[PDB]
Amino acid sequence: CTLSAEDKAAVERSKMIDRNLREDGEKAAREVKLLLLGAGESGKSTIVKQMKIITTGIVETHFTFKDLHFKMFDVGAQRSERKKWIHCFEGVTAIIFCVALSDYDLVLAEDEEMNRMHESMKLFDSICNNKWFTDTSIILFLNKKDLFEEKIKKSPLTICYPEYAGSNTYEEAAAYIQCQFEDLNKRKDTKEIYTHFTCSTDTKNVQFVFDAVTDVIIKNNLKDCGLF
Amino acid sequence: ELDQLRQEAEQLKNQIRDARKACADATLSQITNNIDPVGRIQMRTRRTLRGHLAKIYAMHWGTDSRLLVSASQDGKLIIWDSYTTNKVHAIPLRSSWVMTCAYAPSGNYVACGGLDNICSIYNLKTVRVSRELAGHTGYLSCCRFLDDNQIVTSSGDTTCALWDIETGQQTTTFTGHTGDVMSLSLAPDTRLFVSGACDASAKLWDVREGMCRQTFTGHESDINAICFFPNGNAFATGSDDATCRLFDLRADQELMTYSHDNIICGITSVSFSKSGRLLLAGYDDFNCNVWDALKADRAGVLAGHDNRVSCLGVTDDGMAVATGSWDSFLKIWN
Amino acid sequence: NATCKNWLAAEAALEKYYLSIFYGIEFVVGVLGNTIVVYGYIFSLKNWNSSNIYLFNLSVSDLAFLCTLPMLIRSYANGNWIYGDVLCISNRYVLHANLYTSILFLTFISIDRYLIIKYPFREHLLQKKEFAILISLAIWVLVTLELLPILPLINPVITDNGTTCNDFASSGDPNYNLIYSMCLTLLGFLIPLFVMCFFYYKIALFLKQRNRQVATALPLEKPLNLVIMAVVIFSVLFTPYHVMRNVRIASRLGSWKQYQCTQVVINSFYIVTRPLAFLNSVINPVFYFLLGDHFRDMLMNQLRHNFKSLT
Amino acid sequence: SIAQARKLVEQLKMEANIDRIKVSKAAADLMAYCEAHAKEDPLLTPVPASENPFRE
């Protein structure tokens, strides 16, 4: 009898394994994967603590909001080289980029010349225009909404932007920063940026993340269906 | 003093360069110009392995020459039987970001690692996580077994380490490199090993003493792969500048450069044959090039992958060649 | 003029030239479109899903329907059927079967498009790639079973030593043909039309409701326009043919008017209307496959690849 | 970085007494090894299908 006795058993084992594998795949395709990025001291820890439910290098945070499972990946200790492991995150649903609004008037404290806002701009420009991230959406969080308001009445925004021309208030100045950050995008036809002004006392950030992720998923499905 | 040390190492570098040049009386191409070319190498896919649901990042054969191990970035480590398609094992990982894979020479253990900076050792003849080594401060790039109780790893913190699985401690640390170490290879006698880093450099380390022996340069970019010649007296390196290079140990210099036009992609892996005549290298164009190691002539081409070639291996008996790819398919060529 | 003698000549002119040339252009355009669409769906598509199965089945049905025109085109240009009786019988049967299978596949494409909007991760029984094959096989078998009763009607007329194989509406007994046509138009056209309209109305309502959650992003306007256009094209291209076929069959019942000139009017308008319903088999490839940016880009990328191998 | 420079200079000093050989000798040795095992390389010289584990 061809393919009998132990061989048959072996085949059976393989089949069983295959079944389990398929199951796992069906379980792993229902999770929204987000990549958390920040310039540094940008108030991302508060973001993690906000939507917190349920080693070194990678840090994983699982939570659920309205029958939707989110897995957030944080790379803070990975300081070796971005070019050598960034492509691992090619299939993420979205990139949550955190920027602090209170570091415009304060220097990097190192090199005596780097400005934290300019460093954040450089990081955002590098991440947004990347060969691995061409259709991945970015959710931009602007933290420190209170320190910015408290400091804008004393330190003019021209310290960071020599070409700024306008009033000096909380409004008409955060819009300038948001526009400056959004103008770094060069693929507006295929990519979207969702900007939210996050406050340290605001619990509505999870709602914004959920809305942006649902929009991204719906648009991806429509593109697949040919509408798209 | 700054002057008593600085500006003085350059003198030693100049002396080393002069010594290397003084012994380059001829070239390998001149010696091999009177050798019959191999001809045309034609290999056709014989087995296709399916089951991975994401990119395949590493693979290893094992001295059995029949069983194979593969790792993919979906949290699974699959052990196949090559002669058929049957899966022998499927180990679920605690971390989905894997970059390396190893098969113990005895076939009793397996190793894994990745972005979590931890090397996990699983026992097969018990399936069950046997050990977890965590000393590094960067992503694991490679890991190769020496015995059932010894392992050598390299991390992205510009460091390599020889461990002791019995106690879980770090037996020895190899320092002196500058960039992220991306690959390493063990000599057939397991007394020395070569490591290539992102600083366009390769180094020869002696396991028993933990001291650098020789340093090889010449590449114009990061080095992604490395392989020892079957006789143990030379090795080959592939870098991001779309070129491969052969270095020798006794002469302590470069011998030949395998490069060609219409090739502008980096090399992801390299490997030799049972006799060393051929040199197989996988590229980012989802293909593999087979070069004549003694003539620097492209003897053959292997095509059939869709996204990329990330892992490449040759069995201990030279029967077939296994290639993995970013489309989650492993192919056997004969 | 409005004389009956000019209408009588006008049907000869329409059945000789209009049908032949229109079918000739339709055959070429649809065959080329369906060949391009089919190419790259098997040699360039991996990981098929429920939507792809339905789309591929629709394309295959359109290609099979189009492969039938050439014999009818020549026979209309020549004016006589020179082939065997079995050839024309099989030609007519395959034509009608493929038309109605295409209608059913369009209905199921609309159903799948609604399901994808309702279940974004495909966690549904009808969204896995096992129900799709069963549904396609059932559609094929049921359409063949439904078209089986056509054989007793479409039989060649043996007269003057020349076998004349006339169209479906003109052949057979008026009563049986009328009842069968009225049953076929109800089962194969109206029910699918209503189901497609209902599901596309649901999809449009969802898209409009979901446009209020758009805070600052590109609105969902293009998909709504395409959803409306699908139903508009289907209804406009299919309604006149089914409306006029039954009128032509009834005009042969005799007592309806017992008039001959009326008959010529009715027949001229049916003949003009026949190819409008067939234009769908050529319109579909562009509207469902090439209009999608993803499919067109993939097809172009895989066409430039392998071009160096054969050029 | 006096200690770093001292360590680097010491490493360079130790990496200077390898007692190198000529390139011709290494090339000849590599050629001899390659030619000695020519018939034991299935990839270089394919074996008949009667003894090919991966047949068909």
Swiss-Prot record, chain A:
The protein here is known as Guanine nucleotide-binding protein G(i) subunit alpha-1
Changes after translation: Palmitoylation at Cys-1 varies with membrane lipid composition. (Microbial infection) Deamidated at Gln-78 by Photorhabdus asymbiotica toxin PAU_02230, blocking GTP hydrolysis of heterotrimeric GNAQ or GNA11 and G-alphai (GNAI1, GNAI2 or GNAI3) proteins, thereby activating RhoA.
User: Upper taxonomic classification of the species?
Assistant: Eukaryota, Metazoa, Chordata, Craniata, Vertebrata
Question: Does Cytoplasm show up as a keyword for this record?
Answer: yes
Q: Where is region (G3 motif) located?
A: 70-79
Q: Where does GTP bind?
A: 41-46, 74-78, 143-146, 200
State the superkingdom.
Eukaryota
The EC designation for this entry is 3.6.5.-
Ranges for region G4 motif: 139-146
GO cellular component annotations of the record: cell cortex; centriolar satellite; centrosome; ciliary basal body; cytoplasm; cytosol; extracellular exosome; Golgi apparatus
Mutation: V206E; reported impact is: In NEDHISB; uncertain significance
Q: Which organism is it from?
A: Homo sapiens
Compartments where located? Nucleus; Cytoplasm; Cell membrane; Cytoplasm, Cytoskeleton, Microtubule organizing center, Centrosome
Residues that coordinate or bind Mg(2+): S45, T55
Curated annotation (Swiss-Prot), chain B:
Alphabetically sorted, this entry's keywords are: Acetylation, Disease variant, Host-virus interaction, Intellectual disability, Phosphoprotein, Repeat, Transducer, WD repeat
Q: Which CDD domains match?
A: WD40
Give the GO biological process terms: adenylate cyclase-activating dopamine receptor signaling pathway; cell population proliferation; cellular response to catecholamine stimulus; cellular response to prostaglandin E stimulus; G protein-coupled acetylcholine receptor signaling pathway; G protein-coupled receptor signaling pathway; phospholipase C-activating G protein-coupled receptor signaling pathway; Ras protein signal transduction
Quote the annotated effect of P92S: In MRD42; decreases receptor-driven G protein activation; decreases trimer formation with alpha and gamma subunit; no effect on protein abundance;no effect on complex formation with gamma subunit
WD repeat residue numbers: 44-92, 93-134, 135-175, 176-217, 218-261, 262-303, 304-334
Q: Name one GO molecular function term.
A: GTPase binding
- List-wise, which residues carry Phosphohistidine? H260
Of the GO CC terms on this record, one is:
synapse
Pfam entry (one): WD40_Gbeta
Effect on the protein of changing R94L: In MRD42; decreases receptor-driven G protein activation; decreases trimer formation with alpha and gamma subunit; no effect on protein abundance; no effect on complex formation with gamma subunit
| Impact reported for I78N | In MRD42; also found in patients with acute lymphoblastic T-cell leukemia; reduces interaction with GNAI2, GNAI3, GNA13 and GNA11; induces activation of PI3K-AKT-mTOR and MAPK pathways
Instruction: Identify the PANTHER family for this entry.
Output: GUANINE NUCLEOTIDE-BINDING PROTEIN BETA G PROTEIN BETA
Swiss-Prot record, chain C:
Return one Gene Ontology term, BP aspect.
Answer: positive regulation of chemotaxis
Segments crossing the lipid bilayer: 25-45, 53-73, 97-117, 131-151, 179-199, 224-244, 275-295
Q: Cross-referenced InterPro entries, in alphabetical order?
A: GPCR_Rhodpsn (IPR000276), GPCR_Rhodpsn_7TM (IPR017452)
* Tagged with keyword Nucleotide-binding: no
Q: What is its main location?
A: membrane
Report disulfide bridges, numbered on this chain. Answer: C88-C165
Q: Which GO terms describe its molecular function?
A: G protein-coupled receptor activity; signaling receptor activity
Which Pfam families does this one have? 7tm_1
- Outcome following mutation: Y100F: No effect on receptor function
Q: What protein family is recorded?
A: Belongs to the G-protein coupled receptor 1 family.
Name the UniProt record assigns to this protein:
Succinate receptor 1
Curated annotation (Swiss-Prot), chain D:
Q: Which UniProt keywords apply?
A: Acetylation, Cell membrane, Host-virus interaction, Lipoprotein, Membrane, Methylation, Prenylation, Transducer
Keyword set includes Chloroplast: no
Q: Tell me if Lipoprotein is a UniProt keyword of this record.
A: yes
Expression by tissue? Expressed in fetal tissues, including testis, adrenal gland, brain, white blood cells and brain.
Its primary localisation, in coarse terms, equals membrane
Q: Where in the cell is it found?
A: Cell membrane
Q: Name one GO molecular function term.
A: G-protein beta-subunit binding
Q: Give the top-rank taxon of the lineage listed in the UniProt record for this protein.
A: Eukaryota
GO CC annotation: extracellular exosome; heterotrimeric G-protein complex; membrane; plasma membrane; synapse
* Annotated GO biological process: adenylate cyclase-activating dopamine receptor signaling pathway; cellular response to catecholamine stimulus; cellular response to prostaglandin E stimulus; fibroblast proliferation; G protein-coupled receptor signaling pathway
Residues that span the membrane, as ranges: none
What is the topology of this protein in the membrane according to its UniProt annotation?
A: Lipid-anchor
> Which family does the record assign?
Belongs to the G protein gamma family.
Write out the function statement from the record.
Guanine nucleotide-binding proteins (G proteins) are involved as a modulator or transducer in various transmembrane signaling systems. The beta and gamma chains are required for the GTPase activity, for replacement of GDP by GTP, and for G protein-effector interaction.
Instruction: State the name under which the record lists this protein.
Output: Guanine nucleotide-binding protein G(I)/G(S)/G(O) subunit gamma-2
Organism expressing this protein natively: Homo sapiens (Human)
